């Protein structure tokens, strides 16, 4: 029962890649507009907290939850965004996304000469390595702090 999906968005708000494993609710929206909608929503939540914060939001937003699934968010200071869907309840995954960034992305993307900056990744090695790093802990559930 592995993760549903995983999203990437640049500091300009463009969808880099979407990998799906177990998402089932078949989308009425073509994925690109959906990614745009999600990036805008996340931006909205950033503004939302940055206004209604009692004090400094050092890392600001963390994630949101539903009763029957959950989702988590990762912020990269360069402005790239990380989003994946998980189940509601298992270990946290903020760290797991940090790791995926610092290893899989920084290795199999930027250190790829044939990925031009700010486009869609289409590397079969980045694809397969994402597949395997997810298959590392195909764990579903978050209960994130």
């Amino acid at each position: 029962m592995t993760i549903f999906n995983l999203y990437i968005f640049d500091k300009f708000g463009t969808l880099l890649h979407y990998a799906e494993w177990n998402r089932t609710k078949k989308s009425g929206i073509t994925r690109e507009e959906e990614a745009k909608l999600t990036y805008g929503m996340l931006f909205s939540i950033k503004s939302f907290v940055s206004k209604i914060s009692p004090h400094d939001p050092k890392e600001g937003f963390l994630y949101y939850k539903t009763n029957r699934y959950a989702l988590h968010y990762l912020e990269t200071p360069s402005g790239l965004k990380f989003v994946l869907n998980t189940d509601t309840t298992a270990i946290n995954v903020k760290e797991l996304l940090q790791q995926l960034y610092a290893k899989v992305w920084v290795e199999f993307v930027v250190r790829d000469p044939l990925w031009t900056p700010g486009t869609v990744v289409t590397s079969e090695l980045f694809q397969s390595k994402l597949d395997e790093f997810v298959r590392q802990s195909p764990i579903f559930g978050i209960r994130n702090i």
């Binding site: 199999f108 250190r111 790829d112 000469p113 044939l114 590397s123 079969e124 090695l125």
Partner: protein, 151 residues
């Protein structure tokens, strides 16, 4: 993690190729580089006495130079009788980052020049000569096809 500089820099060289020449890359990189590595090679297996001339297969010296730079070993080493021969390597670092699917093949001559341009020795197969072509069939698998400067 000092490699990242060189991976990015060689990547951007793979990027720009102005139409005047294919490989504007002169070999002074290779010359001064092997001289540096040989500053670190202040010892190599050749006898103290000058007359008894022993040649070091530049195949082996290429192995060692990779360990000094490319860090991963040359694997399949087929050699004809004379100075013509080849290396068959399953993995190549700059092509480790590209998809293994044999779809991006052109990026080799920047690779193969770097193993050319190493000054010769009078005794053949002594370990330093270089003039090399590449035929990368599979992406990680470079195929540096050697031709000595001599016959």
């Amino acid at each position: 993690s000092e490699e990242i500089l060189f991976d990015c820099l060689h990547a951007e060289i793979v990027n720009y190729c102005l139409d005047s020449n294919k490989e504007h890359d002169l070999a002074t990189l290779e010359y001064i580089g092997f001289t540096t590595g040989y500053r670190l090679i202040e010892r190599l297996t050749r006898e103290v006495s000058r007359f008894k001339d022993e040649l070091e297969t530049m195949k082996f010296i290429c192995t060692d130079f990779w360990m000094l730079i490319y860090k991963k070993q040359v694997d399949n080493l087929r050699t004809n009788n004379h100075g013509m021969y080849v290396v068959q390597d399953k993995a190549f670092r700059f092509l480790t980052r590209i998809s293994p699917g044999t779809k991006q093949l052109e990026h080799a001559p920047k690779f193969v020049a770097f193993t050319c341009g190493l000054v010769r020795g009078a005794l053949s197969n002594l370990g330093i000569n270089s003039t090399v072509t590449a035929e990368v069939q599979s992406i990680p698998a470079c195929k540096f096809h050697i031709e000595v400067n001599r016959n």
